[PDB]
Amino acid sequence: MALDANDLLPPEKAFVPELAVADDGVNVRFRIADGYYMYQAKIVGKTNPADLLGQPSFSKGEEKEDEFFGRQTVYHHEAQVAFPYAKAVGEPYKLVLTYQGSAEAGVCYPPVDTEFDIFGNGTYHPQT
Template identity: 30%
Template sequence: MAIRLVLFFAVATCAASMRAAEIDGVDLGTINDPLAEASVFLPVDQAFAFSLHLRPGEDGVEQIVARWDMPAGYYLYRHGFRADAEEGLALGELRIPRGEMRTDEYFGKSEVYVGSVEVVVPVIRRAVRTATVRFAYQGCAEQGLCYPPTERDEVLDFGQLRPAASSQTAILLGAAALLVAVLLTVRAMRSRRAVR
């Protein structure tokens, strides 16, 4: 009986408090719920969508191209990018494009990327066909959430790369194709004259 009485008074007190708040013009739906606010922010994989591809470089050096796409309101820090490889793969210095300067409450004045960014990682030496590369990055939401540094392990299959034709080889192939076209045209013209 005592428990029922306590519950009755607790419910009555809550109901009276809510009614008083409504009379005072307080919109109870606008009270900040920290758990509700957390759902406003995207999960890290959606805030910073990561993709990756391999390409042969013009100078014969293989390249890993890491790309991040971000929706409006999210950005990545230049200082957060890192790539580390396992044994059998040596990586060069990251080639990161210029970003925009921004001052925020977490890191002060920083170079950041909005929309998308591609980071090129040259492969200096490779003694394996497949290798795991760990990519690190960090970003924030403009609404006030800074994500912790994120790391992704990606297994790369270098067997899918085809050697790139050097620019000199490409010029020679183009010249050979042009020569063949000219010879075929001359031959066709001679055939027409012979028929007449």
């Protein structure tokens, strides 16, 4: 609310995950602090009842080269992924998202995994 950027805040509030269920799939977007960045390759996000969903569709970010991973795509703030359905089903499914990155200042924190239960609602958030 005051900063919403830099490494002045913890890795908990530094990221604002948001779920959005659709009729043709599920979309998840997480706002990362300007002082943090997650590697597209390190980031994970899959939603389905039993591996039914097709494949993830990253929203694309910015490619950069470093020594903490090398030359790969990462996010400096915007990080959303599309999960297009691959099978017709009216039953509930499970979603697993994993975030992992470092602070633009020069900090390396551990990965954070979060599961979201989808059963009709649209918007979903972690009860942590």
